[PDB]
Amino acid sequence: CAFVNQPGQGEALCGGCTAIALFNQANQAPGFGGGFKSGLRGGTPVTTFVRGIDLRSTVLLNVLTLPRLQKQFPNESHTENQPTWIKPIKSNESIPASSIGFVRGLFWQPAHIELCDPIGIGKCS
């Protein structure tokens, strides 16, 4: 990578593309190895999205309707439905799959990271 790639692409990043970077790292990226875990699907899951003429239409096409949403995710439950940052994960915890809310699952991040304090105005790398 150091040999073949352009440097300074991670020098400075906008809030948007850092949110995107974070979500991507949480979902489709395989890092960081070591004492770091990926989830919930696993390492390098493949995403399949229906596409439309427009972004709006695309996002809406990939949304689950309320009855089917309820069907795929049986709310039964003892299910906590708060995100990783709202209600944190407990270390070494044994979490049953069915106990995860459809909210907690979609925005699940096991990375356990904080964004350092921002800086001023400039071009995003």
Q: Binding pattern to RNA, positions 3-42, x when CB under 7 A?
A: xxxx------------------------------------
Q: Binding pattern to Zn ion, positions 56-85, x when CB under 5 A?
A: ------------------------------
Q: Which is nearer to RNA, 8 or 35 (CB)?
A: 8
**94 near RNA (CB under 7 A):** no
Query: Three-state DSSP class for 100?
Result: strand
Q: State which amino acid sits at residue 47.
A: T
Render 3-47 in DSSP notation, one character per residue. TTS-S-TTS---HHHHHHHHHHHHHT-----SS----SS-SSPPP
Q: Which is nearer to Zn ion, 24 or 82 (CB)?
A: 24
**124 near Zn ion (CB under 5 A):** yes
Q: Which is nearer to Zn ion, 11 or 110 (CB)?
A: 11
Residues followed by a gap in the chain, C→N > 2.5 Å:
none
Q: Which is nearer to Zn ion, 9 or 62 (CB)?
A: 9
**Which residues are 100's β-sheet partners?**
80
